[PDB]
Every structure is written in C-alpha cells, then in structure tokens.
Amino acid sequence: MNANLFARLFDKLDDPHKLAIETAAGDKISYAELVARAGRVANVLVARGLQVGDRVAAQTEKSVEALVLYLATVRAGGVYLPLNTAYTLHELDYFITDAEPKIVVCDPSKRDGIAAIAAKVGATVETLGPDGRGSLTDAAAGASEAFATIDRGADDLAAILYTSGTTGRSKGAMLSHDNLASNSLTLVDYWRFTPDDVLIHALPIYHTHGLFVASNVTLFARGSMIFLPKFDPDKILDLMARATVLMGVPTFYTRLLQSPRLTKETTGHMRLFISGSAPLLADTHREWSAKTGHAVLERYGMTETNMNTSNPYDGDRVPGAVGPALPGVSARVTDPETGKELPRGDIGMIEVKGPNVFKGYWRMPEKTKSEFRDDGFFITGDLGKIDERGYVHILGRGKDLVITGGFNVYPKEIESEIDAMPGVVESAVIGVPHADFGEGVTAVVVRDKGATIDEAQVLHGLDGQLAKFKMPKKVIFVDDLPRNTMGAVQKNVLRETYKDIYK
Ligand SMILES: Nc1ncnc2c1ncn2[C@@H]1O[C@H](COP(=O)(O)OP(=O)(O)OP(=O)(O)O)[C@@H](O)[C@H]1O
Ligand SMILES: [Mg+2]
C-alpha cells in the first residue's frame, strides 16, 4: 500500500521480461531491466547525499538514462525537477536557487558553469550526456540494483515541474505521488492502453506531456514505447508500421500533413493518434481524417493539473473541443470575477478539481491561495464553455481576451475566419493599446509563399462575417508566428513586439 509512484508502477511485476523501451538506436529494455537500472541510480542518489524530500534538478538531452533518473528520484523518495534543455546558465540560476536541489544533473559540456550555480545551494553535480554517458552513469555502473523503494503517502511530493512560462516567469508546480498515479491510471483505462500498445515517443521529457502522460500511461499499461530524440516526420512515419499510438502536439499533425507519405496505407497499422498541449484546430482535425481516415483524440491538461479532460476513445471525438472531464475530475465554468458557476453553454473561466490537481506552487503560498476558490476548485486561467453534452471547449487564455470599445472580443473565431481565407496558413489575433478604443484588435498572419492576399482583402473578407466592434484595426503579415519549445503560439511575445503600433 506504498503510494510511492515507483512502487505503484513496479512493486508487483507479473511479466518482467516484457519490452518497456526501445531506444532510438534500437536497443531493447525489459520492465525488469528498467527497474534494475532505476535501482542502481537510486543508490547513486543516496551515495551523493540525497535525503527523503530533496529535489533532484535535471537538465539533460532526452535518453532512456534520463527517464531512469526520473524514476530513480521518485523511487528514492526524492522530488524530481526536470528543466528545459534550452535554459541558459543564467536562467538555470533562477530555478536552482528557487528549488534548492541537493543534486543537479546536467550535460557534460555544461558541468563547469553549472557547478558554479550549484555551489550557491550546496548541491552535488553529476553529468549525463545525450548518449547516456557521464559521471552519473559511471557511478551507477558499480552500484547495487537492489533498492528498498521509499514509503510515501498519497500527498507526498514526487515532482516539481515549472510551467512553460507563456504568461510570465515559470512557477514550480508541486506534484504528489497520487496526482501522478491517479491521472495515469485513469488514462490507461480511458484510452484503452494494453500491454500490446507501442507508443511512438518523440516529445521532450521536461514537460508534463512527454514525461508523465506518455511514460506513466505506457508503464502502468505494461505496453512499450519507442524513443526518438525529437520530432522527425519521416522516422515517425517509418515507425507507424510497427507501432500503435502516437502522442503529439498540433504542430506534429500540421507537419505530418505536409508529407506526401502520409496516407491511409502508411497509417493503417495505428490504433490511436492523440493531440495535446496546445489547441488542435478543427480544420486540422478534419484534414487528418480526410487524409488518413483517423479521428485524432484531443485532451486538455496543464502543468498544475495533469490531464483534466479528454475526447472519448469510444465516443464522438469533436473537432475544436477537448472533451468532457475525465473520470474523477470535475470541471466547471464560472463568472471570471464573482466565481459563480454559469449555465451550460456560457463562456467563462474554466476551473477544475480532483486528485489530479497539484498541491500548490513551490514556496509561493500566497500566489497559491489566489489561484484556488474557497471550495477547492483551481482557476485554470483558461476561458471556455461546457456544452450540453459536457464537452469542454477552450476559447483562449484569459490574457488573450481583447477588450475594445467596451466589448469583450474573443480572438479564436476571428482567427478561424482569417485561417479559412485562400492564401492563409494561420493567424493570431491579439490586442495592443489603442488610445481611441482601449485595445486595438490586431491580426498577425502567416500567408502561403506567393499568395496574393493582402490587408484590404483580409479586412473586406471579415467585414461581411464579423460585427464591426470585432474588426481588426490592422493586419500584419509575418514569416511565422513565435512558438515555444512545445509548439504553443506565444501571444505574450506578439503583444510585446507590437505594443507600440498605434502610438
Ligand atoms: N488541448 C488544448 N487546447 C487548448 N489549449 C490547451 C490545450 N492543452 C493545453 N492548452 C493550454 O496550455 C496551458 C498549459 O500549458 P503549460 O502547463 O505547458 O504552461 P503554460 O500555461 O503554457 O505556461 P505558464 O503557466 O508558465 O504561463 C493550458 O492552461 C491551456 O491554456
Ligand atoms: Mg499556465
């Protein structure tokens, strides 16, 4: 009855020699082998000063060794803290100072620089490279495989993941053993994962999607995964003939749609395509079904909440919607201010509650308090509505709402109109200060190479479909939209870039 995620996963292992992970080089690792690797690394953590509750901060390229470090940290009663591989030394200083890890694991090439930061909190530094080699690996080579998995309670911490930083400086979400186990166990059943599943895993593992959703679901299900270092369209297509599931972000799908190899035949062996982490556009959903005959299953989650909602595996998968609340999870829509729940169909603030919901922000009890309602619901900061069937629809982030001339203007329906115009790839509608209207609705648009469509053409096209107060005051064409490492459009960046256009 140990609640320790590692114990939930592996204490009882009925089929130990079954495949768990195939590496990018084609090496194969069984469940028993994975467990033994984690035992060695857990012993290394203790030998390097880990005490129960200590954080282990890890910035490494993706590898099975890096995944093992996650498992071992949890197993040893530590708190795993993955960090975006792109963070610079200076950025890392903030996270290391905030979290005060006892151990920091980094790429061999950064050891000297990171050691300086680590010394500020007295952390021990080990290394792990893209090839799975380094001081961590040397230490594990002589360590014992046997390790008594540490007793942990449901609410004890297993991890701290920093948010993606879309709306400001990343905050450290404190995730418990039960947060992670309850969510992944629910998903195994809800998505019907079985030991026969083979998951193509091409996502980063410093983010909740690639780290927890991909790994924990597979591992609980006793299925396996195939690692790829990053999104590679041709390698992903190659693997579909011998895999059953792909978890991706919308950019995976729009990029795969550009391959002439993406056909019914090429995807015919696959069971399920899942999309998450950013909005899957309804047009993208329809394009995928038109080209491949598969209905993409989209789900919605956050760093702070793990997965909240999902389109059903055995029900209607609705373009533009993220599905009803998962089993065990409650979702509602409230008046953003007052907090009163709204009638089904009304747009407002999405709030969630459940065993998936985190314990708060690391050493930010005040900001934690402001993000929870009195009755324990968490304010997502996402605006949307819940339809008559209980499907949640996300309209945008609260900060993406544009208030202009006294009106609430929701950008997505404008973007949908612009996207539908011939010559348009995609568009982002934002608001920036305007002296006459409060904010000026501004359309930032990516067009096809050689497309003729221009500003006047775009505004005229909208004129006959859109209320006057919703009309963009100008259209700005760009080579591409700014996106973070997980493929999300950064409207924060756009608002900053164009803040002065109406000055
Ligand atoms: N399927 C989806 N459809 C629409 N939006 C989504 C979906 N999945 C995730 N999102 C958006 O991503 C957010 C979760 O992102 P994440 O936890 O990676 O950090 P972030 O919110 O982007 O960064 P920060 O919290 O630092 O501002 C959600 O709150 C939601 O706005
Ligand atoms: Mg957020």
XYZ file of C-alpha atoms and ligand atoms in Angstrom:
535
model
C 0.000 0.000 0.000
C 3.018 2.240 -0.563
C 1.727 5.252 -2.508
C 5.199 5.842 -3.990
C 4.653 6.119 -7.761
C 7.585 3.754 -8.392
C 6.014 1.143 -6.134
C 2.567 1.599 -7.747
C 4.264 1.055 -11.101
C 6.607 -1.825 -10.304
C 6.229 -3.455 -6.841
C 4.109 -6.180 -8.443
C 5.546 -7.015 -11.863
C 3.807 -10.042 -13.381
C 5.537 -10.073 -16.771
C 9.080 -8.833 -16.039
C 10.726 -9.774 -19.336
C 8.210 -7.925 -21.496
C 9.558 -4.958 -23.516
C 9.252 -1.492 -21.916
C 11.503 0.723 -24.011
C 13.177 0.569 -27.399
C 15.824 3.283 -27.670
C 16.498 5.406 -30.747
C 19.452 3.112 -31.529
C 17.216 0.037 -31.390
C 18.364 -1.347 -28.041
C 15.580 -3.065 -26.104
C 14.949 -2.778 -22.366
C 12.526 -5.012 -20.439
C 10.447 -3.997 -17.416
C 12.841 -5.897 -15.122
C 15.848 -4.237 -16.748
C 14.246 -0.807 -16.365
C 13.555 -1.486 -12.691
C 17.164 -2.636 -12.120
C 18.579 0.454 -13.842
C 16.449 2.615 -11.560
C 17.643 0.727 -8.508
C 21.268 1.476 -9.401
C 20.595 5.154 -9.963
C 18.535 5.426 -6.769
C 21.544 4.021 -4.891
C 23.739 6.598 -6.597
C 21.416 9.398 -5.461
C 21.743 8.289 -1.811
C 25.534 7.968 -2.246
C 25.552 11.574 -3.489
C 23.699 12.934 -0.460
C 20.012 12.564 -1.302
C 17.689 12.637 1.696
C 13.935 11.986 1.502
C 12.171 15.070 0.152
C 15.280 16.538 -1.506
C 14.941 17.863 -5.052
C 16.957 16.461 -7.937
C 17.215 19.026 -10.748
C 17.919 17.603 -14.191
C 18.757 19.346 -17.423
C 19.789 16.705 -19.916
C 19.124 15.748 -23.506
C 16.495 13.051 -23.815
C 17.563 9.417 -23.309
C 16.456 6.288 -21.514
C 19.075 7.160 -18.869
C 17.289 10.484 -18.315
C 13.948 8.698 -17.913
C 15.569 6.303 -15.446
C 16.798 9.303 -13.424
C 13.180 10.446 -13.097
C 12.059 7.005 -11.955
C 15.006 6.610 -9.552
C 14.495 10.016 -7.956
C 10.858 9.201 -7.217
C 11.781 5.718 -6.013
C 14.371 7.126 -3.585
C 11.801 9.464 -2.015
C 13.241 12.499 -3.782
C 11.413 15.167 -5.747
C 12.183 15.131 -9.475
C 12.683 18.522 -11.146
C 13.240 18.383 -14.929
C 14.358 21.591 -16.616
C 14.007 22.655 -20.223
C 17.175 21.652 -22.052
C 17.246 25.102 -23.660
C 17.582 27.140 -20.446
C 20.850 29.092 -20.303
C 23.163 29.197 -17.287
C 21.601 32.461 -16.153
C 18.066 31.086 -16.445
C 19.095 27.912 -14.597
C 20.350 30.036 -11.718
C 16.778 31.092 -11.052
C 15.371 27.558 -10.905
C 18.254 26.135 -8.889
C 18.030 28.999 -6.421
C 14.255 28.661 -6.182
C 14.181 24.867 -5.715
C 17.431 24.362 -3.749
C 18.061 20.850 -5.160
C 20.521 18.591 -3.327
C 21.612 17.116 -6.647
C 21.859 18.646 -10.109
C 22.342 16.501 -13.212
C 23.494 18.262 -16.369
C 25.180 17.769 -19.724
C 28.934 17.113 -19.539
C 29.532 20.182 -21.708
C 27.983 22.497 -19.117
C 29.432 20.999 -15.971
C 31.828 23.814 -15.066
C 29.241 26.570 -15.490
C 26.530 24.659 -13.642
C 28.871 23.705 -10.798
C 29.223 27.423 -10.031
C 25.441 27.856 -9.708
C 25.135 24.585 -7.792
C 27.674 25.700 -5.197
C 25.323 28.535 -4.214
C 22.901 25.995 -2.735
C 25.481 23.348 -1.888
C 24.233 20.875 -4.496
C 26.269 17.963 -5.812
C 26.674 17.886 -9.602
C 26.593 14.736 -11.768
C 26.573 14.556 -15.558
C 24.580 12.699 -18.195
C 25.042 13.299 -21.924
C 22.809 12.691 -24.964
C 24.494 9.305 -25.295
C 23.593 8.225 -21.756
C 27.210 8.577 -20.631
C 28.643 10.740 -17.848
C 29.532 10.743 -14.157
C 26.006 9.605 -13.210
C 26.407 6.555 -15.444
C 29.895 5.801 -14.116
C 28.550 5.881 -10.559
C 25.600 3.620 -11.443
C 27.864 1.018 -13.069
C 29.245 -0.116 -9.705
C 26.042 0.413 -7.673
C 23.691 -2.315 -6.425
C 20.426 -2.947 -8.288
C 18.523 -3.745 -5.077
C 16.796 -0.736 -3.529
C 14.031 -0.575 -0.931
C 11.550 1.820 -2.520
C 10.834 4.607 -0.028
C 7.451 4.732 1.714
C 5.466 7.760 0.522
C 1.904 8.924 1.205
C -0.639 9.980 -1.409
C 0.045 13.691 -0.856
C 3.833 13.480 -0.553
C 5.743 15.199 -3.346
C 7.047 13.242 -6.323
C 7.958 16.156 -8.572
C 8.149 19.889 -9.193
C 7.565 20.966 -12.777
C 7.927 24.573 -13.787
C 5.249 25.910 -16.103
C 6.187 26.754 -19.691
C 6.483 30.499 -18.976
C 3.847 31.544 -21.525
C 2.203 34.166 -19.268
C 5.235 35.135 -17.180
C 8.150 33.637 -15.259
C 7.671 29.882 -14.873
C 6.275 28.792 -11.481
C 7.095 25.495 -9.719
C 4.094 23.190 -9.509
C 4.296 20.728 -6.592
C 3.072 17.338 -7.829
C 2.230 14.490 -5.458
C 2.553 10.748 -5.889
C -1.241 10.467 -6.073
C -1.517 13.357 -8.580
C 0.640 11.349 -10.982
C -0.614 7.841 -10.269
C -4.323 8.694 -10.243
C -4.142 10.569 -13.542
C -2.130 7.977 -15.467
C -4.202 5.063 -14.117
C -7.371 6.854 -15.273
C -5.894 7.446 -18.725
C -4.820 3.812 -19.180
C -8.475 2.751 -18.905
C -9.957 5.760 -20.700
C -7.695 5.426 -23.757
C -7.764 1.591 -23.570
C -3.966 1.125 -23.375
C -2.923 -2.518 -23.117
C 0.334 -4.488 -22.964
C 0.174 -4.729 -26.776
C 0.459 -0.985 -27.297
C 3.617 0.500 -28.787
C 3.878 4.250 -28.282
C 5.968 6.381 -30.620
C 7.570 8.797 -28.120
C 9.029 11.870 -29.831
C 8.245 14.504 -27.180
C 10.536 16.317 -24.725
C 10.609 14.782 -21.240
C 10.989 18.028 -19.292
C 7.293 18.700 -19.947
C 4.249 17.012 -18.386
C 3.137 15.560 -21.735
C 6.295 13.614 -22.649
C 7.357 12.911 -19.072
C 4.177 11.837 -17.273
C 1.407 11.289 -19.797
C 3.494 9.333 -22.303
C 5.661 7.409 -19.803
C 3.336 6.725 -16.882
C 0.424 5.600 -19.058
C 2.637 3.210 -21.052
C 4.361 1.836 -17.968
C 1.145 1.252 -15.993
C -0.378 -0.415 -19.065
C 2.663 -2.687 -19.472
C 2.928 -1.536 -23.077
C 6.153 -0.201 -24.554
C 7.480 2.887 -26.226
C 9.958 3.735 -28.941
C 12.156 6.758 -28.188
C 13.022 9.352 -30.785
C 15.194 12.337 -29.843
C 12.794 14.816 -31.423
C 10.020 15.259 -33.959
C 11.175 13.733 -37.230
C 8.340 13.293 -39.748
C 9.979 10.520 -41.788
C 11.135 8.494 -38.792
C 7.688 8.787 -37.198
C 6.047 7.669 -40.461
C 8.528 4.766 -40.708
C 7.598 3.594 -37.194
C 3.831 3.596 -37.684
C 4.020 0.230 -39.469
C 5.158 -1.346 -36.182
C 3.570 0.916 -33.553
C 0.030 1.570 -32.331
C -0.086 5.027 -30.716
C 1.335 8.481 -31.353
C 1.101 11.249 -28.784
C 1.753 14.636 -30.364
C 1.133 18.369 -30.228
C -0.786 20.116 -33.016
C 2.453 21.020 -34.841
C 3.131 17.273 -35.163
C -0.088 16.897 -37.133
C 0.197 20.001 -39.308
C 3.787 18.987 -40.153
C 2.886 15.348 -40.864
C 0.079 16.618 -43.110
C 2.785 18.155 -45.318
C 4.350 14.758 -46.091
C 3.375 13.025 -49.338
C 3.943 9.783 -47.419
C 1.020 10.416 -45.061
C -1.672 8.117 -46.420
C -4.220 5.561 -45.244
C -1.731 2.776 -46.040
C 1.140 4.395 -44.146
C -1.022 4.819 -41.030
C -3.122 1.666 -41.326
C -1.453 -0.245 -38.505
C -2.016 2.546 -35.952
C -4.651 2.322 -33.179
C -4.771 5.884 -31.917
C -3.490 9.416 -32.538
C -3.584 11.749 -29.544
C -3.138 15.528 -29.540
C -2.424 17.761 -26.548
C -0.517 20.711 -25.056
C -1.945 23.377 -27.422
C -5.206 23.797 -29.380
C -5.792 21.288 -32.171
C -7.553 23.446 -34.781
C -10.826 21.982 -36.023
C -9.626 22.344 -39.615
C -6.548 20.301 -38.693
C -8.758 17.592 -37.222
C -10.815 17.433 -40.393
C -7.715 17.452 -42.609
C -6.292 14.496 -40.675
C -9.489 12.465 -41.028
C -9.761 13.405 -44.718
C -6.171 12.358 -45.473
C -5.741 9.328 -43.191
C -9.197 8.265 -42.055
C -8.169 8.563 -38.388
C -10.031 10.725 -35.879
C -7.465 12.466 -33.675
C -8.267 12.232 -29.960
C -7.532 15.535 -28.204
C -7.152 16.011 -24.447
C -6.539 19.054 -22.242
C -4.201 19.370 -19.297
C -1.815 21.757 -17.571
C 1.430 21.501 -15.680
C -0.527 22.231 -12.474
C -3.363 19.783 -13.069
C -2.096 16.963 -15.253
C -4.900 15.888 -17.589
C -8.361 17.380 -16.984
C -10.493 16.418 -19.971
C -10.323 14.129 -22.969
C -12.351 13.275 -26.006
C -13.674 9.718 -25.514
C -11.923 6.753 -27.088
C -15.253 5.086 -27.830
C -17.402 8.146 -28.457
C -17.544 11.283 -30.605
C -14.191 12.993 -30.955
C -15.189 16.579 -31.615
C -13.104 18.952 -33.754
C -12.409 22.122 -31.754
C -13.305 20.580 -28.375
C -11.194 18.940 -25.644
C -13.844 16.536 -24.334
C -15.684 16.066 -21.051
C -13.957 15.942 -17.664
C -12.019 12.713 -17.095
C -13.277 10.195 -14.523
C -12.567 11.544 -11.043
C -12.145 15.110 -12.348
C -14.674 17.915 -12.002
C -14.756 20.841 -14.414
C -16.982 23.909 -14.410
C -17.246 27.359 -15.965
C -17.577 30.422 -13.745
C -18.020 34.168 -13.951
C -14.364 35.186 -14.076
C -14.904 37.826 -11.372
C -17.635 36.670 -8.961
C -16.810 32.987 -9.351
C -20.424 31.821 -9.649
C -20.925 28.862 -11.972
C -22.551 29.754 -15.298
C -25.309 28.000 -17.281
C -24.037 25.303 -19.664
C -23.012 26.973 -22.909
C -21.994 30.311 -21.379
C -18.388 31.440 -21.769
C -16.349 31.990 -18.631
C -13.402 30.858 -16.550
C -12.625 27.134 -16.556
C -11.997 25.722 -13.083
C -11.121 22.147 -12.149
C -10.966 19.973 -9.036
C -9.788 16.407 -8.450
C -6.976 14.044 -7.410
C -5.078 15.233 -10.480
C -4.833 18.792 -9.145
C -1.460 19.856 -7.712
C -0.703 20.856 -4.118
C 0.305 24.443 -4.968
C 3.311 26.479 -6.103
C 6.734 25.823 -4.532
C 7.333 28.431 -1.808
C 4.575 30.677 -3.181
C 1.742 30.074 -0.673
C 0.217 33.495 -1.389
C 0.016 33.037 -5.166
C -1.229 29.526 -4.469
C -4.091 30.921 -2.352
C -5.186 33.368 -5.038
C -5.466 30.599 -7.646
C -7.871 28.435 -5.646
C -11.531 29.109 -4.923
C -12.830 28.690 -1.374
C -14.346 25.316 -2.302
C -11.027 23.998 -3.590
C -11.510 24.428 -7.345
C -8.372 25.555 -9.213
C -8.664 28.567 -11.527
C -7.094 27.398 -14.806
C -6.763 30.864 -16.302
C -8.317 29.380 -19.450
C -11.586 30.775 -20.831
C -14.197 28.472 -22.339
C -17.613 26.841 -22.146
C -19.112 23.449 -21.448
C -21.728 22.308 -23.954
C -24.955 20.408 -23.341
C -23.116 17.090 -23.730
C -20.472 18.067 -21.172
C -17.687 18.603 -23.707
C -15.333 21.410 -22.721
C -14.427 23.975 -25.385
C -11.407 26.226 -24.814
C -11.752 29.707 -26.295
C -8.378 31.050 -25.195
C -6.256 32.114 -22.260
C -7.760 34.839 -20.058
C -4.923 37.151 -21.130
C -5.889 36.627 -24.775
C -9.286 38.233 -24.358
C -9.334 41.602 -26.119
C -11.378 44.411 -24.582
C -12.077 47.135 -27.109
C -14.641 49.946 -27.285
C -16.429 48.466 -24.286
C -16.723 44.997 -25.844
C -15.298 41.592 -24.995
C -13.704 40.259 -28.169
C -12.709 36.585 -28.357
C -9.835 36.085 -30.830
C -10.367 32.463 -31.872
C -13.482 32.964 -34.021
C -11.703 35.788 -35.841
C -8.647 33.600 -36.380
C -10.932 30.850 -37.734
C -12.367 33.282 -40.278
C -8.934 34.511 -41.343
C -7.498 30.982 -41.489
C -10.280 29.969 -43.889
C -9.258 32.564 -46.474
C -7.359 31.331 -49.555
C -3.655 32.035 -49.137
C -3.613 31.963 -45.338
C -1.620 29.422 -43.347
C -2.577 30.635 -39.879
C -3.320 33.797 -37.924
C -3.071 35.106 -34.382
C -5.369 37.848 -33.214
C -4.163 39.989 -30.337
C -4.954 43.253 -28.596
C -2.490 46.068 -28.019
C -3.036 49.532 -26.516
C -5.105 51.918 -28.631
C -5.899 55.448 -27.432
C -9.338 55.548 -29.066
C -10.529 52.007 -28.300
C -8.629 50.762 -25.244
C -7.161 47.866 -27.184
C -6.785 47.599 -30.951
C -7.683 44.170 -32.327
C -4.677 43.276 -34.438
C -4.291 40.314 -36.783
C -0.870 38.746 -37.241
C -0.980 36.495 -40.275
C 1.237 33.898 -41.970
C 0.466 33.502 -45.671
C 1.486 30.958 -48.313
C 4.554 31.632 -50.438
C 3.359 33.691 -53.398
C -0.172 34.159 -52.056
C -1.665 37.491 -53.120
C -3.942 38.058 -50.135
C -3.339 41.439 -48.505
C -4.642 43.532 -45.618
C -7.556 45.074 -47.514
C -8.503 41.658 -48.851
C -8.479 40.228 -45.313
C -10.488 43.072 -43.726
C -13.024 43.002 -46.553
C -13.408 39.255 -46.110
C -14.126 39.768 -42.415
C -16.397 42.760 -42.971
C -19.245 40.563 -44.198
C -18.918 37.979 -41.426
C -17.966 39.899 -38.299
C -19.557 42.538 -36.063
C -17.942 45.948 -36.517
C -16.537 46.126 -32.972
C -14.714 42.840 -33.625
C -12.916 44.056 -36.768
C -9.106 44.090 -36.703
C -7.740 47.642 -36.934
C -4.827 46.283 -38.943
C -3.352 43.137 -40.438
C 0.346 42.389 -40.074
C 1.859 39.661 -42.260
C 4.877 37.780 -40.876
C 7.122 34.892 -41.945
C 5.995 32.829 -38.964
C 4.400 33.049 -35.528
C 6.570 32.833 -32.392
C 6.230 29.452 -30.645
C 7.789 27.935 -27.521
C 9.649 24.624 -27.491
C 6.353 22.697 -27.140
C 4.812 24.379 -30.196
C 2.456 26.827 -28.490
C 1.939 30.256 -30.097
C 3.386 32.972 -27.853
C 0.869 35.811 -27.891
C 2.798 37.268 -24.991
C 5.671 37.730 -27.441
C 3.402 39.227 -30.113
C 1.763 41.688 -27.713
C 5.244 42.848 -26.685
C 6.554 43.092 -30.244
C 3.635 45.228 -31.458
C 2.735 47.086 -28.264
C 3.536 50.459 -29.908
C 1.899 50.144 -33.331
C -0.973 52.515 -32.502
C 1.221 55.077 -30.744
N -5.892 20.793 -25.947
C -5.696 22.101 -25.635
N -6.436 23.068 -26.221
C -6.251 24.373 -25.934
N -5.349 24.827 -25.059
C -4.536 23.969 -24.414
C -4.667 22.525 -24.666
N -3.756 21.915 -23.885
C -3.105 22.878 -23.196
N -3.569 24.104 -23.518
C -3.092 25.394 -22.965
O -1.819 25.201 -22.360
C -1.870 25.505 -20.974
C -0.971 24.542 -20.210
O 0.351 24.872 -20.638
P 1.625 24.588 -19.728
O 1.195 23.989 -18.410
O 2.560 23.805 -20.619
O 2.283 26.028 -19.393
P 1.746 27.478 -19.913
O 0.405 27.756 -19.268
O 1.819 27.463 -21.404
O 2.866 28.428 -19.238
P 2.688 29.333 -17.905
O 1.814 28.602 -16.925
O 4.074 29.494 -17.336
O 2.053 30.608 -18.422
C -3.337 25.398 -20.604
O -3.585 26.183 -19.439
C -4.017 25.876 -21.865
O -4.027 27.308 -21.944
Mg -0.232 28.182 -17.249
